[PDB]
């Protein structure tokens, strides 16, 4: 049950990657 969620908010740019 993989519940990973990352977020990269830089220079008005949010790179969220909710893997699972």
From TrEMBL:
<protein>
    <recommendedName>
        <fullName>BRICHOS domain-containing protein</fullName>
    </recommendedName>
</protein>
<feature type="disulfide bond">
    <location>
        <begin position="9"/>
        <end position="14"/>
    </location>
</feature>
<feature type="disulfide bond">
    <location>
        <begin position="5"/>
        <end position="18"/>
    </location>
</feature>
């Amino acid at each position: 049950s993989p519940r990973v969620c990352i977020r990269v908010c830089r220079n008005g740019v949010c790179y969220r990657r909710c893997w699972g």
